[PDB]
C-alpha cells in the first residue's frame, strides 16, 4: 500500500505540557480568519501571513503556546496547543507555520473551561459488596462480560442488556466494528473525540457532540449517525449523491478525515473515499504541495452545481496501492438518510 503515517505528519509543510484545570476562567488568543469546529485531540495545521498573527505566535511560544478556536456568532470553542512550529522566510515572504492539537472545550477571549463530565458505571451504585471482587475480568466473551459485569441488574428494574447500551467499553466496541469495516484509543473520552473528528457531518451537527459533555452520550449518539447516514451528498445542490459509506476508507493514520492546509492557509477537512460519482475534473494533475506524497490532485466539482467538492487523487507510480481515490472536503458534504 502506501505509508499511512505520512498524511498525519504533514510532510508537505515539542513536549506539550500545559493544561488548565476544569471550570477555570482563562484569557486566550483567538486567531483571525480561522473558521472550523475543532475537537479535543483533533490535529490542526496552519499557515499565517499577517504580522499581527506572526507576532501573536512568536510571543505565544512563551508561556501557554495555546490559542482558542471558535460558529453558529460563537458561544463555545476549543483550546488548541501548538506542538510544532517553523518560521520560514523563503522567497522573501515571511511565513510562520504551526501545527496545533485541540485540548480543552470552553464556553483575547474571556473563557470558562467546560469540564469533561465523567460518571461511574451504571452498577457502581447497586453493586453487591460480595461481587466487588469479580468486577475485574471471540464475541461470546461479550456475552460473558454482559452476564458478569451487569449481574447486579437483578437488583434494579431493568435487564442486563439495557445497562449494556450505556457501557462505554461495549459502545466503543460497537463503534469499532464499523471503524474496522474499512480498516484506536482505549479511554472512552479519547475514543469519542477521535471518531467525532472522523465523522463527516456538517457544522451544525459537529456542535452537538461538542455540546455533549459525557463520553457515554457522545459514543451513543455517535453510533446513531454511523447507522443513519449511509449516503453523502453535495451540500450546495442537496439532491446529488457523491459517495457512500461503503467507499469510505482511512488513508490517513488518524482516520478517514483530518484537517489539511492548502498553501494559502485555508483548512480543509478532506474525507478519503475509493469511489465518487457525479464529479467533473478540471485542470491537470499536480503534486505541488500535495497532502498525500506520491499522489497528484485534480480539482473535482459537482457535475450539477459546479461547487468545489474536493479533489481526485491519482498515483504517480504504477506500483502504488489505491491508485485512484477521492478526497472530499467536509464543508462541501451533506449526510443523508435515503
Amino acid at each position: 500500500n502506501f505509508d499511512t503515517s505520512l498524511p498525519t505528519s504533514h510532510t508537505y509543510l515539542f513536549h506539550g505540557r500545559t493544561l488548565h484545570d476544569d471550570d477555570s476562567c482563562q484569557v486566550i488568543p483567538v486567531l483571525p480568519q480561522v473558521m472550523m469546529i475543532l475537537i479535543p485531540g483533533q490535529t490542526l495545521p496552519l499557515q499565517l501571513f499577517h504580522p499581527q498573527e506572526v507576532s501573536m505566535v512568536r510571543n505565544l511560544i512563551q508561556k501557554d503556546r495555546t490559542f482558542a478556536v471558535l460558529y453558529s456568532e460563537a458561544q463555545f470553542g476549543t483550546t488548541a496547543e501548538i506542538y510544532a512550529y517553523r518560521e520560514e522566510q523563503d522567497f522573501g515572504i515571511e511565513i510562520v507555520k504551526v501545527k496545533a492539537i485541540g485540548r480543552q472545550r470552553f464556553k483575547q477571549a474571556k473563557v470558562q473551561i467546560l469540564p469533561e463530565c465523567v460518571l461511574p458505571s451504571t452498577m457502581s451504585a447497586v453493586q453487591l459488596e460480595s461481587l466487588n471482587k469479580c468486577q475485574i475480568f471471540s464475541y461470546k466473551w461479550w456475552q460473558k462480560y454482559q452476564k458478569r459485569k451487569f449481574h447486579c441488574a437483578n437488583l434494579t428494574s431493568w435487564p442486563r442488556w439495557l445497562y449494556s447500551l450505556y457501557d462505554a467499553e461495549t459502545l466503543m466496541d460497537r463503534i469499532k466494528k464499523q471503524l474496522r469495516e474499512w480498516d484506536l484509543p482505549s479511554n472512552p473520552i479519547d475514543f469519542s473525540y477521535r471518531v467525532a473528528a472522523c465523522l463527516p457531518i456538517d457544522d451544525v451537527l459537529r456542535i452537538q457532540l461538542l455540546k455533549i459533555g459525557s463520553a457515554i452520550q457522545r459514543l451513543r449518539c455517535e453510533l446513531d449517525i454511523m447507522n443513519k447516514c449511509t449516503s453523502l451528498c453535495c451540500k450546495q445542490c442537496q439532491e446529488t449523491e457523491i459517495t457512500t459509506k461503503n467507499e469510505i476508507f482511512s488513508l490517513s493514520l488518524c482516520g478517514p478525515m483530518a484537517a489539511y492546509v492548502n498553501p494559502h492557509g485555508y483548512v480543509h477537512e478532506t474525507l478519503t473515499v475509493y469511489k465518487a460519482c457525479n464529479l467533473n475534473l478540471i485542470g491537470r494533475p499536480s503534486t505541488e504541495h500535495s497532502w498525500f506524497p506520491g499522489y497528484a490532485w485534480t480539482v473535482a466539482q459537482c457535475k450539477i452545481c459546479a461547487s468545489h467538492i474536493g479533489w481526485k487523487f491519482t498515483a504517480t507510480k504504477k506500483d502504488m496501492s489505491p491508485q485512484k481515490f477521492w478526497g472530499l472536503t467536509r464543508s462541501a458534504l451533506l449526510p443523508t438518510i435515503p
Partner: peptide, 25 residues
C-alpha cells in the same frame, strides 16, 4: 496560467477570471 484560487487550486490566465471564481467562495 499563473493565477490560482486560494481555496481549491483552480488556475486561470487573467487576473479578472480569477476574481470571477473567487466571488463564488
Amino acid at each position: 496560467r499563473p493565477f490560482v484560487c486560494s481555496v481549491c487550486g483552480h488556475r486561470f490566465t487573467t487576473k479578472g477570471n480569477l476574481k470571477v471564481h473567487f466571488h463564488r467562495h
